[PDB]
């Protein structure tokens, strides 16, 4: 709870309150969490403008989830890889995130390949998804 | 029974790792006190204040061996001290019903109960046939309250600047959260400026003077029934 109280401070400032859309939708990610854009939409709608220390502390505790496992993330690439070779196409990789689920925007996408080494290859290149899953869940590759 | 004895129908809870985690028994105690108004079935306690003269007592174990037909004292020793008997009472927490709201209650501590077996009738002289009344809805003047912040241990420091009643463990925590609050002057709880109190033989107005013959507080209407009214 000391990490929650500390990290809330450097963003809220002296007002002790986050009114910005971006800074409260994101701040739980320093604490180790993954709140969705739809989840923070319901959070900001219930606290309807102000976010205080008590509201953030349970925003961390009610989003601790046991579905961040490698078994559930490998099943997503397993169906698209019907041959079970452990590799998918890079063109398949793009529709999986831009188009499926929440539509990922283009700007944060350009920083995605810069940190996962997917910018230097061409669109139809063969890519593995085991480095994709392990680097995302911060397991050692 | 010589000493502190317990009376049935009284708010009387418990004093006080893997044993302290049952602290929720006090939270349920204050929950039950607020949930129900307690007339507490005030009673018809009829007691005999017997001047029991015990003397040169022999130390004896529990009652089953101090029964007259199996001990047979000498003419020197005259009573039997039941060592591992009685109950040896306890306890601080007690609700009060202060004015029009509930509180708590930290009763007087440092109790005992010493039980003596007396075997002949001339060591017992009844003196008074006391008919007395115990009602929990009245005022309890032995009224040490708890810390406001910590809601836990009995308060013994009153900070006049903070306007809060505090025990030692919470009072340190009051004054360390900011540099500014460290320099609050901290008087003990003792006899904080609260009031002087309204009269009991008639409500409404407060005491003003003192009597000094029968030591009791005197109000503005009280000196007329005072025969020495000067002192």
């Amino acid at each position: 709870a000391l990490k929650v109280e500390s990290a809330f401070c450097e963003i809220s400032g002296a007002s002790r309150t986050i009114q910005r859309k971006e800074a409260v939708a994101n701040l739980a990610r320093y604490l180790g969490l993954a709140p969705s854009e739809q989840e923070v939409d319901t959070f900001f709608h219930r606290v309807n403008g102000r976010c205080d220390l008590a509201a953030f502390g349970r925003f961390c505790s009610l989003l601790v989830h046991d579905e961040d496992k490698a078994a559930n993330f490998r099943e997503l690439f397993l169906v698209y890889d019907k041959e079970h070779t452990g590799k998918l196409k890079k063109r398949v990789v793009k529709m999986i995130f831009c188009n499926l689920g929440e539509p990922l925007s283009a700007a944060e996408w350009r920083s995605f390949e810069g940190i996962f080494d997917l910018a230097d290859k061409k669109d139809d290149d063969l890519v593995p998804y085991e480095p994709i899953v392990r680097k995302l869940l911060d397991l050692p590759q | 029974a010589v000493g502190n004895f317990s009376l049935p129908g009284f708010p009387l809870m418990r004093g006080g790792t893997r044993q302290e985690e049952a602290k929720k028994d006090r939270s349920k105690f204050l929950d039950a006190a607020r949930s129900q108004l307690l007339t507490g079935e005030r009673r018809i306690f009829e007691y005999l204040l017997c001047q029991v003269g015990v003397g040169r007592s022999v130390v004896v174990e529990d009652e089953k061996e101090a029964c007259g037909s199996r001990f047979s004292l000498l003419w020197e020793y005259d009573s039997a001290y039941l060592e591992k008997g009685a109950l040896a009472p306890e306890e601080s927490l007690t609700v009060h019903y202060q004015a029009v709201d509930d509180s708590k209650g930290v009763l007087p501590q440092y109790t005992f109960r010493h039980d003596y077996v007396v075997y002949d009738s001339s060591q017992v002289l009844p003196r008074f046939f006391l008919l007395f009344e115990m009602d929990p809805s009245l005022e309890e003047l032995f009224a040490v309250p708890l810390c406001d912040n910590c809601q836990d241990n009995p308060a013994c420091i009153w900070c006049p600047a903070d306007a809060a009643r505090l025990c030692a463990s919470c009072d340190e925590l009051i004054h360390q959260q900011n540099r500014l609050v460290s320099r609050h002057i901290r008087v003990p709880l003792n006899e904080m400026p609260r009031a002087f109190g309204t009269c009991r033989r008639h409500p409404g107005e407060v005491y003003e003077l003192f009597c000094s013959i029968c030591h009791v507080a005197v109000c503005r209407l009280c000196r007329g029934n005072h025969l020495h009214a000067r002192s």
Partner: protein, 98 residues
Amino acid sequence: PATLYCPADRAQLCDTCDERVHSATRMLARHVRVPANHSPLQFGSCPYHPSEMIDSVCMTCFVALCPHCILIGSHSAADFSEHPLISTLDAYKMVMQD
């Protein structure tokens, strides 16, 4: 230019960091914040001791006393012990309402 005062914690601390150092728990929330320069530490120096401000006033000898002028001042004698000592803002409001 400082105007807010806390009567509980004696600190003349307008605006500024009061939004962040005086809003922590249920503790710091109550803490009345009497504004408009209603500060007992603003009536001038003590004429004997020119370092502290007049914040207490005597209601028997009727002299203006700073903390130095009451603790080891002229009013710190043995016979000057039972005299009532109200705050100086309590004194000024008293003259206004008679």
